[PDB]
Structure formats: C-alpha cells, structure tokens
Amino acid sequence: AAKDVKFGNDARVKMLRGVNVLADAVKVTLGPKGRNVVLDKSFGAPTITKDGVSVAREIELEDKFENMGAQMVKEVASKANDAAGDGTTTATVLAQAIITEGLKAVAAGMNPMDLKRGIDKAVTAAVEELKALSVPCSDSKAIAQVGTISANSDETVGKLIAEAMDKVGKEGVITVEDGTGLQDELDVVEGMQFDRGYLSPYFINKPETGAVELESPFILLADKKISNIREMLPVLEAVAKAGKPLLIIAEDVEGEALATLVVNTMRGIVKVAAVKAPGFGDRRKAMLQDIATLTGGTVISEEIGMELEKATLEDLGQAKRVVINKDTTTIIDGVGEEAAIQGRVAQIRQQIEEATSDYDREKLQERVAKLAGGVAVIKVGAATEVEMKEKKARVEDALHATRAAVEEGVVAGGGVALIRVASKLADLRGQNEDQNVGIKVALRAMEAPLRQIVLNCGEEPSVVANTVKGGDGNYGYNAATEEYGNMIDMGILDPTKVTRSALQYAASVAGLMITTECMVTDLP
C-alpha cells in the first residue's frame, strides 16, 4: 500500500504537537488539589475521575503523525509504573519539559549528538546525588509508620503489615484475600512463586487488575514442545467432567493448539491457562521436578517413555489456588506431604555440600530457600461488605508501597527532592559549548513538578520555588496547609525508587526523539 514520508523540521513540528496534547490532558490531576476529568462511555452516564492512568489510557488523535508521537511517549512512560508502582504523571511531565527546550535549541543550529551526550551526563550526576541524600528505613517501627502514612492514617493496616512481615521475613511473599467477617487472621501454608507470564491475553477474567485467578484447579506438567492440540483431547475430556479448571506448564505452545485453546476458553466451555516453565537447561527439568513434588502430580517426559495419551486423572496435580499476573505466577497451598518435602530438602542440601563451584552452590542455595521457605495469607473482615472490599484495596496499595520502601529507602517527597538535587549541581561542565547547553536544559527541566503543584493551588510559582531553593536540607513546602518546614516530620515522603525510575525513563525517551530524521506512514 502506498506510503507517505516526511523529512526533518516538517516531521518534528508534528511530533511536538502530539506530545503537547497528551501532556495537557494528563497534567491537571497532579497533587492534592487536582481538578477533574470527564470520560465518555457508550452506554449510560459519563465517568468523572481524578486519576492519571485512566485518562492516559484513552487518548488517541486523528492525524497520523501526531498520533505516532503521542503513542511513542506513552509506551515509555508506562514502564516506570509497571516497575515501581507509581509515577506515570511525573514521567510524562518531565518528558514534555525536556523535549520542548531541546527542539527549540536544535532549531537554532547546534548539533544534536552533543545535546544528547550532555543530557545523559547531567542525569547520571543527579542520580549520584539522589542516592547520597536518602535516609534508611529498616526497623519494624519505621515499617509500621511508613505503611500507616501510605494508607491514609490507619494504624490497623500498618501494624498488620508489619507483624506479618516479621512473621515471614523481608524476602517472603505476602498475599491478601477475603475473610469470614470482622476479625483479622494471618497464617502460613505451602506455596510457590516464579517469573513467567501468561502466554497470551484474553485469558483475563477480572479486568480491574488485568490478572487471572483460578480456584482449586488442575495442573499438568509437560516436558516437551506442543503445537498440535490433537494429543491433548483425552486429558481435556477427563478434565471436562467434574467441572474444574486447568493450568498447563510446558516449555512452549505454538500455533494451532494456542489458537484453539484461546477460542475454547473464550467461548465459555472449559477453563484453561498455560505458561512456560522457569529457566532453561537441565535446571528447567529440575524445577519441574520440584514443582511436581510440591503438588504431587506427574511429570510427563518423553525421554523416559511417556506420551500424552498415556495419562489418567490420577496423574494430574491439584491445589488450592493459583494467580497469574502479567509477568509473575503464584501457587497457593497444594497437597504435598511433609516427608517428601523433607527428603527433597535433604537431597538438595547434600548436593550443595557436594558442589565444586561457587556458581552452582549459589544457585542451589536459591533453590533450597525457595522450597523450604513458605507463604503467608492475610484475611480481612469488615461487616457490611462494601467496607470490606474498600479496605482490601487499601491494604493492597499499602503492601506495594512498603515493599518498595524497604528496598532502597525514602526521601522528602511532594516534589522537593528533585529541586534540592538540581540545586546542588551548579558547577557541572563538559567538553565544548554544546554540551554545556545540554546540561543547562536538563537542570532547568528538573523543576517542573513543583511548579505545577503550586500552580494548581492558586499561588505564584516563582516566589515559592525561589524560597525553597534558598534553604538547605529537607526544608520544604506543604501543599495541604500552606506551611514551610521539615518535610519529614509532616509525614510527606516517597520511596527513592520511583523518583529514580521516572527521571531515567523520561531522559531516555527525550534523547531518542531529539535525534530523529525521517518518518514513514500510511496514506489517508
């Protein structure tokens, strides 16, 4: 089909227009005084919202080039949210702030590659500072305080989170689900978790979280490569009776069987989801064996002489609950006996003692920790269901925040950390003129979030920014009350990880977009 191409300045102006529309739509909802946005739907009343993610998901424009620009900034921005748990809006605002200044500079005749190099240098120095300024948070009392603050001033959730984390340990896995009514419980059972996502969309049955959840399903182990659904019919029918769902872990499923399973699970009849085994090499077989021992199923390996028609209903595995996220998989409370687990642990323990290299020894240490560790379950009850579901959502949010915090530490939030860092770096210089210009652009763009937050509260931005630069330490500004002071005592703070991630990802996308030359697309 015929295409259409655009060169240079003509392309850059279009891309700029697209990013401008996206930024203006998203950035009013920043801060604690945010305005509202109205989203239309086909059926019924519109929706009113105050959240950045929901607004960002919807935008797509008319003209082709501008839409390409918007999509391109959007995809990069999303990853920070996926990785850390907050900060999409901040990334978008930073990207706009760098791109505008950079393109204005480029139109005046400076080289692009120099600007790129300068911006990267400034970002790296800033990250060094940001690590230096932080403060630790390791003891249990601080854990409780952080959880309480993140959950909008409720001591119950905070102390519950803290006590559970003490129960299992900082590296453990924590899961939350519904209880039986107005009393909190927490317990330990046999569980598992590993890094493999679903093989395809449309397995989702609960759109709110984009995740798949199955209760008391059947589990099938496959040590082979499957592409033809023909040999799956006997086990599929045996599972069709008794009305129970199914989970397939193999090395890979391609083509015919994949599409057929998609259609079958999408037309109701039968419930099946499938994923790849963890790792590769002989360790892949070893981990399959370990999962088999845990669930008490059957490993079907061709080399020993199995085939798919050869399995009966006894051979499958059965367990309490399974959850599949986009890139993580969790198994909760199977059936295994203690004796088999203990023997497995003994064998792997001695193989550790038998090791001849640090690499294999450390891998085996991983495996024993994963197996003989455990899982913890939290049950919350609230007496009038509506409150119960609301509380459950809040607990989940607090859990993510606490994990991210204990990883790397916290720092004065609300947008002051970045301005403090950028104030400590007035000295930085480069090789020639152009790198100096690039450094200045990055430093002057690091101020956008605080100026916006102040602008929503109907104040004068420049005065407040000037005063905040004037001081030292954590001395900052509180938007909710109009006061200066120690930001750490007023209970406004953020994990370090989110600030670092936002900064790096925005810098990346701006760098790519400064130095493009041609654009190729379809014809209207």
Binding site: D282, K285, A286, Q289, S301, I304, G305, K310, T312
Partner: protein, 88 residues
Amino acid sequence: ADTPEIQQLQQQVAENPEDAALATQLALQLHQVGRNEEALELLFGHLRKDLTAADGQTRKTFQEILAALGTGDALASKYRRQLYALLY
C-alpha cells in the same frame, strides 16, 4: 515362584552383594515369576549407588520391567516417579 534357579541366584547374590550384573539377572528371573516388588527393589538399590551399574544393564532391565508392568500398575508408577527423581 520359589524356583530353584531363583534360589541359586539368591545364594550367589548373598555371596557377592556388590555384583550388579548378578543382581540384575536375579531381578529379571524374579520379575518373570511375578515377584516384581523384590526385583524392582533390588535394581533400584543398585541404581541408587551407581546409575551405570552393570555397564548400564541394571537401568535398562529396570526400565524394561516397568514397561512390562504397564502404566496401570501402582507399583510401577511409584518406581517410575522415583526413577525420574534419581535420574535428573
């Protein structure tokens, strides 16, 4: 099932318990009269020491016996699982 050949092989195995090939022969004869528990126990005991016992004949025999017992056999099933755990 207490055949004279099995008896002499049993005495010879008792005299030389480390001989994997002798035990493999005795296990084959035990299996041929339906004494599969004893045969598989003997062969697996040898395999636990050395996977290449009797220059690999112990394994082979073992697996062959399992193949002879069929997939519906509870005793074989068990051993099958154990074998995998031992092999990999």
